[PDB]
């Protein structure tokens, strides 16, 4: 019932999302789908899962590039690590490359258009949590 949610982002992007989400913490806990989760949101830079947020070509690449490091690194010791890709608001190229990245990882890809859309945060959140639930 405690989930360690890491959040990757470039240029404070992971921090803004962590902040956005924390403002909704009732009693330092979270209500989703009629349940109450204690989430520990840990934004990062260079039960658990990983939010990956990007808003441009550069941020998308950092995420790719960073997942690659973890990949190569992971080899010398991952398949079930609950990723979820979040695109935060030509837009079409972002979605297409993000969706191929999502496809490669077999992870949900969510678009989040009040800087972030609450309904979309929730979908993203249920993404990671249903994946976490699946791994058990």
Residue numbers in the entry: 594 to 639, 655 to 685, 691 to 702, 710 to 733, 739 to 761
Authors' description from the paper:
The p190RhoGAP proteins, p190RhoGAP-A (ARHGAP35) and p190RhoGAP-B (ARHGAP5), are key regulators of Rho GTP hydrolysis and are highly important for maintenance of proper Rho signaling. They share over 50% sequence identity and a domain organization containing a GTP-binding GTPase domain, four FF domains and a C-terminal GAP domain. We identify two GTPase-like folds in the middle domain of both p190RhoGAP-A and -B which we term pG1 and pG2, and show that they are important for GAP activity toward RhoA. Thus, we classify p190RhoGAP pG1 and pG2 as psuedoGTPases.
We obtained crystals of the p190RhoGAP-A and p190RhoGAP-B pG1 domains that diffract to 1.9 and 2.6 Å resolution, respectively. The root mean square deviation (r.m.s.d.) between the two pG1 structures is 1.8 Å over 128 Cαs, and 2.7 Å (135 Cαs) between the prototypical small GTPase H-Ras and p190RhoGAP-A pG1. Crystal structures of pG1 reveal similarities to the Ras-like GTPase superfamily. All five G motifs are degraded in p190RhoGAP pG1. In p190RhoGAP, helix α1 (which follows the P-loop) is extended and sterically occludes the phosphate-binding cavity. Switch I (G2) is completely absent in p190RhoGAP pG1 due to an 11-residue deletion. Switch II (G2) is also degraded in p190RhoGAP pG1, and places a glutamate side chain (Glu636) where the γ-phosphate of GTP binds to canonical small GTPases. The G4 and G5 motifs are disordered in our structures, but their sequence divergence suggests degraded ability to bind guanine base, and in our structures the guanosine-binding site appears to be sterically hindered by the side chains of Glu606 and Arg739, which form a predicted salt bridge with one another. Taken together, these studies establish that the isolated pG1 domain of p190RhoGAP is not a nucleotide-binding domain.
